[model samples]
Target chain A: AKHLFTSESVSEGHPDKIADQISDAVLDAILEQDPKARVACETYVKTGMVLVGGEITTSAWVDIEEITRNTVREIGYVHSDMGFDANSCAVLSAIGKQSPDINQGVDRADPLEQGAGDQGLMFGYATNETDVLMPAPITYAHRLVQRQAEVRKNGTLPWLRPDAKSQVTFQYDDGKIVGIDAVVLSTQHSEEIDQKSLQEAVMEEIIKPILPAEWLTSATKFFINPTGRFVIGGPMGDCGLTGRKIIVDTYGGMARHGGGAFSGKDPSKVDRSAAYAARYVAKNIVAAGLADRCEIQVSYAIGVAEPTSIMVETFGTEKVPSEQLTLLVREFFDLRPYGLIQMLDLLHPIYKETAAYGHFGREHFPWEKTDKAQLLRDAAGLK
Target chain B: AKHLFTSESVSEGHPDKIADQISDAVLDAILEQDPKARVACETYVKTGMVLVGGEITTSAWVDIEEITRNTVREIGYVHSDMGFDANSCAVLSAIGKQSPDINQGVDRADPLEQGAGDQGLMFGYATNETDVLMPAPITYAHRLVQRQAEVRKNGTLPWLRPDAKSQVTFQYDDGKIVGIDAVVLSTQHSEEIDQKSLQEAVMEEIIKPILPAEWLTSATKFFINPTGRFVIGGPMGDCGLTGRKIIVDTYGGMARHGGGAFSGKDPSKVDRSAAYAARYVAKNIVAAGLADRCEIQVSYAIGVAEPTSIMVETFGTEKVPSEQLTLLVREFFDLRPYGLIQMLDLLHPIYKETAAYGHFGREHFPWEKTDKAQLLRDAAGLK
Candidate 1:
């Protein structure tokens, strides 16, 4: 069978990602002072202002204005000429105390028996198509935009601006990635650059170096800055809010998503923690060679220590029966809401790094570890 | 093989849904006067404030404050005692003109060649699990929350507040739905109701009346208000943003999502229109009996009239080759940016209703129609 699959990624300067980064920065700052803090910070950005609001229950207090400005500055939005300036932009805080009525289900005397922060479903997926055990289309899509940011910051493309997006369509034969069908890269730039020169520079500096040479063929198509000009970008062109990039943050449409966003949320919310655990489990299953691909879904209800449902799918690539794999998963992975926080050591302020790129493919994240591969293999009776 | 799957839905009174509704309401108000309006409205609600921000270039002028308050009031958030009042909350607007540099690609001489509003991927999925041809988990999940709103408005559950969430887990055997394993429903209510009475009333008035008797077995578990209490809810307890409920907006977690949010955007944006087109295609394919399960993926390049790629998958249930289905789709469906707008007759203000409930299953939406089923069947050479 032959097919084309597509995935896309937005640069850190994208409006929605700017909101995501700010939200996570607040979460990280609070955790740095009080790891036990319950935070569900959300951010909204447009033109010249940022609004930070959501529920929080913590003894530690941090300057949200300073955090929001610092996040925007780090993402290359420090200058007013860029239509947004971190130092000058308006920052409003609507921070409020978490509802005690809702907190009753999450706070328990026994730490290990803590109930899920909310009711929702989450999914995790892994594939053997890339060295990182992620779907090839998304992995490469992230690289293209990541390379754009790199060149822009490194002065390789002096005219390039902060806002950028990349999409990759991969042609697959018999479920194996064979070649690239098309690539779309759009980047905001300074008014001084011409479209022809910008296209040439991007092709040589970003596309050629980042994408694999073997994947590029005569039939491969590239659309660079297809809209011709992108001088006005970022929040000036669009309004952005946190949790809008849930798909880009995960498997990039290669797998199903529970629709829960990871940024601005603490480990207590199963939306963030259990999703990481699900990824941890699925990655290990594929790494153990028990399956070429794997996806796992887990659901939880408020005040419930045990998941309401656990499902495993191997796409007919499983060496062992899926039921046995499910049983082994239950035996090894601690999926309780509290157990996930402990298993992944999720209380730290490391979420700021995950606000961009692909969360699962990055080796720095603890959830991307394959240390449990051998254990899973032995449990599955695999040689 | 036997497995379990879960999906969730949130009522219109939920904070995120409230934001979605407000944004779409603004869009509808603008479109009512100016059918050619270029609107990208984003809304954020937190406690006592509603922020409306995004890019718009329309000749018509409407009072956004009035629209926002009316939307909130209609969603049942009329009193400050409910934690958020439509009458008292501050309404802020940061609206700006659409970027001229970006609009060049979209304003072509020939309307048929109007470029895609943005570059991204969109997915559509269908299954023969329910009469709606949607996945069983999500179909039932929507009903549970929809019933919550029904009983609350009909005065049967006067104590029931606006905010609510529902989760359903279904057991499947050999690709057919067998039974429901668990249900989790958490609804905000007034202090007048006790936990025991609330749970009993909910089971009687909401769950039992909505869920099928055959799907409920002795082993079926129900967790109503698992948090013990949920008196404080909606924007008072949590921040809400448009497009935050994309998962609940679509097929729950059963289908892949392209990471583009649908609310507050006009049909010109491929993120919204292409998604509706994909759903229209997938539902028609399943309705044509060409497949028991079907999913379609479409990608577009910004400033391009034609989609970059269109792919179809039937999960091994296709009556013909997947490539043939893809070819038939191209022959019958006009996937250009303007083509989709015309095909779905999308210029109207009907989006406000789609802001709540699932976007695909409702019969009221043009995308939910099976008018193309017979055409697709004839094209596919199927009876």
Candidate 2:
């Protein structure tokens, strides 16, 4: 039986990703000054306004307004006519102090006893279907837009605007990707660009460069700016908020999500750290050939030192029992609120890059590393 | 092998949910005046501040400021001492018109030709482990917080404030929920209540009533207000933005999400309309006994009237081949954006209630109904 699975990704200029980048950029700014600072920053961007709000417990000083403007400009939303102008937009700050009650749970007299920042769940997933061990549809969907950003910034497509979206529908034959059924890519463009050229340029420049050769069969359908035009886009077209693009930020709907958003949050929050630790664990298992697909779910209760529960699911692709893999993950991954921060070395200014592209596939990130593969393979008796 | 799954929920007064309710309230108010209004509203709340923004296309003239205040008050945040006050908070409106470029493509001259408002993926899931056909952990987690709201509003828990959170971990044997591993409930309360009394009252009143007796055992552990204090919480405790609580709003972590938030969105947007349609399809499949558990996914391309792809996964619990069941769905369910709006009766002003609590479990909602179950079963050759 054949089935179709589709996943989508938004460009960095997409309103929600703009908000995500802003929140994480501010977080990185704070982390740069004070690595130990606790932050839970949230952001919102609309037509002519940028609002930075959220509680933070930090000894570092941050210019949030400058960060917001710089982020918008960096994302290529610099003109007043382009829906949003970082220079002219009103920047307001509502930042404040951390909730004392919630803060106390995260910082303990003994670092070993540091409790979770908040109660929530997070998930991690990896599959052998793609080179990055990510789902094929999502991995390609991200590349479609990342390539758009690349060509735009590189001056190959001078008329290309910042905001864009990509959706890839992969045909599956019994749990494996066989081919692509359809691909959709829509990008905002300058007023001078006509629809005729827009569609041709997108298909040739954006889609062809990213999608693999073998997967693109003759029957594969391509829809470029299917609605015909996408001139008014980005922050001006839609209001954007932080953490709204969690699905795009992670496994692209390939695995279950704990509903916790990772942007603008400090490492002490299990929602961010534990999610990364879960990925580190799952990626290692799949890389070690323990399974063709692996998904790990971890849940924490605020003020509790250990996770409430840890679950592993390989969708029957595991060489060993899922129960055995779960035990192996528990024994190896230090998933406590503080331990995961150390395990991933997450206190650096590394989150801003994770705001747009799929967070799990990028290898330079600590969580995407396969360094623990050998240990996991030996423990599971794979060698 | 045994494993565990966990889910959590926050009360309506929780910061993010407060924004969700406000956004939905505004949308509902507009819908009441103009049912065909195209709206995408977003709200943000912090201490003494409520900002509403998003694009809208409607001829109706409604007081957004009143709607924002009324929504906050309705969620039980009244006094300044209660972490928020509707009367005192600054209600600012940045609401405007729809992105003209985004609008022209969606509204077709013929109702049948109407296209998806946006391009994205959405998922809906249902399982027979609970009578409501929802996963056990999220259903119970939602119930725990729902019960808190019930008691506080009913005057049973006099000292209870509006903000509270609940987490439930269900122990699973094979694929079924076997017992409760742990239950965590935390509530914002008056300063006068002692910790001991709070714990006892929460266990006796909130915990004992909602959870199933068969699932609880002597081994079950409970943690009440694990952080020891939640007095200063809600909007003041942290900044909240709309769409942040998507996991709690749906099946928690039990299912994958396409990262679409239901609040502040019109039915014309496929993210909201198709999401409800997917739930309707999945719930009916489970109710018809076609499968013990069903997860349905449908994705659309903007300006494309029909879904680009549809998929079904029953986790090997299906009575027939999943591909056959997928065809059965295609025959019965009109999954186009416009079709789903009519099928779910989603144009009405009922979304405000769906803003909080899990949207799938409540019986009164149109999407939660299994009216199509018999049709689906009969079509699948079941008596």
Candidate 3:
């Protein structure tokens, strides 16, 4: 049936994403120094304080306070008046060594038999609803808040602050994108701007610049600061923890998630790496033109190199049987933890930038590439 | 086409769920005293330390440390030798006032016009594949871990410690459950138990008893503590944060999640209440025999009382047209934030237990009730 679907996005300056960035920044710091590091960095951000805690086993030592401060500073939380100044806030860290008992299977003597860091399932999804092979609702939702952060940094709207949230509702006709139903943008701003000026300027500069013009019809409702007066924002008003934005971080609820977080985690953790690999697999499948849409579920057991299960759903869009598609995936892709790291070249200091503005659908990320599409197409015998 | 699906669950004492339980325990302690409390408590647990921080606005003043200790103690982390102890762990709390701007729309003078506490879309799903209307893979996965805690507390296995994780992968053909492919169970234990004994006992006591005999075929794979040992499990080995287990807390990736976690949030927050209401709505539709399966998506604007959109998908198994089905839901359901609180009686101190073993698919929870089935069936002209 015809229906409406919605997705949400939060700016990098938002408290939860702030914790995410800090953790990944820490990850990148240590990862760059020690490529063989095993990291699971978690972050907690509150008023006047930031705590980075988790387990890591690396041959290098990095400055935790420096990483947290620089990460927050880049996010534009530099002044005390912003309520969470990077330089003034206290920093605490507790990174214990990785559990020896937990990694017997992961750090195998044989390089080819490396097991998964943890036992969990991951899903990768791709759809041709947008030019980027992403779902339209979440794609636009990401653009809205991304635009807000861009304008804040570029000084196009000088009053715009760091913390903001955006939601977009897309109307669909029989599962196809039709129009926009409603738009909500609640942005933190400075006192120099009044309510009317902030709303009008944001409508013109932020909302209109991103969302397609035709979709913003007379019936489409726009709610900018619907509650009004968002002066107090960020960690000053809320507590944010790493991985709390799992939905916004990935497919934005447009696809099913395995509930594992990517930020602050090294490629060694199956939660981050396998999830990345899953997206690469799904993207390549769709790019092969074997399916108009693809969603793959791959699960693993801790210490087990091979996955426990792999499921594929083309949602009636597969040109071939789902079984054959899954078989093709199993034959061509390496879903193991070690295989994922090598396949995607994820051992680089490429994690911090992926923390914000959604993890998928962006360019330049190795997981977003369709390099394997030609191989899969020929293997599947697709013309 | 054939496929495999996987879902996982963690024992109540698992590290991430520990944070979730602690957060909800604080919420319950405050909610019991102040029914109108607006609490968003978050907890982070590391080695021998617990930090509870968030935004709370209420007349009640509860002992945060006492609640944390009691919650931890109940989860069986009482001895320091177990890597963590309730009586000895450090407890720190820093909760601030709720953002005034966030409530400007939520706290309307007219109670009926009260808006949602946040902006997001939530989905509710129900299927008759199992007795509980939950997908089989997640249902079985949850029971496997639930039984782990039950037997541990009952002294069926004295060597068992507090932390554990379980994963079950189910085999499906043409979208129907056929069998189980694999099962993984990893539990922390005392030194008294050897690896062989632990594996044998867990298979006999925890796994075999919970899984259906027919589903446990000779072809099914079982891996118990595949990593060799897990003595240093729980927060001692890993840092745990609130809301990180959103997938495990619900349908375990079988159903789409809105990404808003339920634990620690007050019912006024649409992230919690609307999600519960959405489940109730989906369960009733399936119980009314309107469809073989049902999933409903509802979105809200933070300051607006009326939902921005409502949509329903029955996966082509609807007795009536999907359009008529969605209309029926609109006519019968009160999805507004305040309406959900009243309809489901959610303003109670019943959140702590819900923080573990999954929030949905259980009996006795108010949102899990299906009393509306009668009304729905009659209204749908399905006499």
Candidate 4:
């Protein structure tokens, strides 16, 4: 029987995405300067103000104000009349030093002995629905927003502003995307661009560029700036808080989330690292043909080197026995915080780009690497 | 094969939870004064400061400073040297009025024609796995945190502070909770309490009190404040942002989510109302024996009167055919914005208590009422 599943995404210029970008940029800067910087930054952007507050345990000094302005400017919030200007906004920094007591478990004699930075579960998932093995609706939703950014920055869409959101609903039949059911694109624009022109251009240029032709049919509904006008948007129209878009920041609710935020968090935090590794395992399992769709959840306690529990669900889509695949996953995957960082090479300053869109399906992300496909395939006796 | 599923919960004093409580408090106040107020409040708390920002369209004049302090103080962050002194903490409000352009669609002439406040998807789920129909892991997880708060306020745990987190992993055998595979409890404490004493107190008073004796076998792994010290905690040791814990806020990774947040919004927002309605519907369906387990998803476009899509997945636990239950649900329930508010009686100021614990599966919550079970059963001709 055919079943319905849905996911959503926000454009990079959306207020929440703007905050995510800023937080991750700050984390990347600190990680670049100090590979072992214990940083947990959170960002809040609204109207004419930006608030950056979190704990830091690094010798390196990064200008958060510059990072904030750059992130806002890149998102197209440069003008003051928009209610929030990157140049004129007040950037308040209340970040403080990391607490020594909290760092005890995370810092140990052997670097391998480092406990999880915090106690929480993180999840990662992959499916063979798209080229990236991600669910289709979120993939196209992300592409639409990414294209909006590209055209706006390239002057192809002069009236396009910074804040926007895109949603795609794909109709599925027999567990595959047959066609797009609906497309909702709401973008902030200059007063000059009327509703009709904006809608037409969005359908022709932004939406059409990424979405495949066959996905659109006469039955598909296109809602472009459905509210008629979106002159006011971004942080001014809606407040942006870091970690608010965890679903968009990760699997778009296609898979389970461990209820943890990724941006501003370093790899040491199990909330971020474990989730990345879980995806690596799930994606590899799918790549190895063990399953068409897989979601692996790993849970941990603070200061414990190993996960307290790990579970995998293949949704009855597994080619191999579920128990056998679970055994293989346990044998092949090193889910500890330290081992996961080493296995995925997560210390690099590449996290900033992952703050938006789906995290598990991107080929550019090292955590999405399926280099372990051979090992899993061999273990599953399918090589 | 049976599988283990995990969901986590945090005490109200935990930093991220503090943000949730404060945001909900603001919502509660606004709703109490004016049920028609449109509020989307977000809060960030760290160390001794609180920043509140979001869009709110209301005639109510909320003293955000008082609200923030009261929420924190109520969460037990009252003392000065405890790291975060709620009474003297700095409070900043960046909240502003909602944009008129965004409001044009939502404000309609007919009271029944109210549109969704935003465009997004939301999920509601229920199961007969537990007495409350919530997954066993998350039910125990919420009890653990709730127990910590109860003990702390009752002075049974004198050294305990305002911050704590609880994670539980349950072992399922043929879809029934056989035993708790592992339990992890991390709580903030004063420096005067040594690691040994803290562990003993937490195990005897906090962990053991909440988890039922029958569920904990000798094989259950217990990690109680595994780290040596948690002296410095709450927002003082980490950054806290609103909506950061959506997974914890919902089904705790057991079911799917629509990526829409529930806090700081009135019943007019489908993110809050429709989700409640879905839970009401799903719970009624499960209680009616339509399914042993149920997950329902519904989506809405901004300015749209009706849901764009309505879906149900029973995970093959349905007693009746899924299509029959779907038909019965559609016939028995009113899911539109205004219809949902009246059906759930959601206009009351009863959301603040829901901000911390998992929103669904609450026995006291109006949405979780199974009073509609008879109607659903009769509609489906099951009785």
lDDT of 4 by residue, A292-370 (tens): 8888888777776777778778777877777787878778777666777788888888888888666665787877777
Q: Mark the regions of model 2 whose C-alpha exceeds 4 Å error after superposition.
A: A98-109, A113-117, B97-114
Superposition error at B291 for model 1 (Å)? 0.9
DockQ for all candidate structures vs. native = 0.72, 0.74, 0.71, 0.64
Tens-place lDDT digits, model 3, residues B224-250: 877767776678667888868888888
lDDT by residue for model 2 (B32-151), tens = 878888888899888888889877888777888899987887877776787877788899888886633446445453655464567899999888888888886888888878888889
lDDT agreement with native, every candidate: 0.82, 0.82, 0.82, 0.77
Error of 4 at A188 (Å): 1.1
Clashing pairs in 3: none
Best by lDDT: 1
> What is the C-alpha local distance difference test score of candidate 3?
0.82
Candidate 3 lDDT, A137-175, residue by residue in tens: 788888878888788768778877788888888888875
Provide the lDDT at B347 for model 2: 81
Residue A67 lDDT in candidate 3? 90
Prediction-by-prediction clash tally: 0, 0, 0, 1
CAPRI grade of model 4: medium
Where model 1 places Cα greater than 4 Å from the true spot, the runs are: A98-116, B97-114
- Native-to-model Cα distance after best TM-score fit, residue B45 in candidate 3, in Å: 0.4
Ranking by DockQ: 2, 1, 3, 4
- Residue A124 of model 1 has an lDDT of 88
Q: How would the docking of model 3 be graded?
A: medium
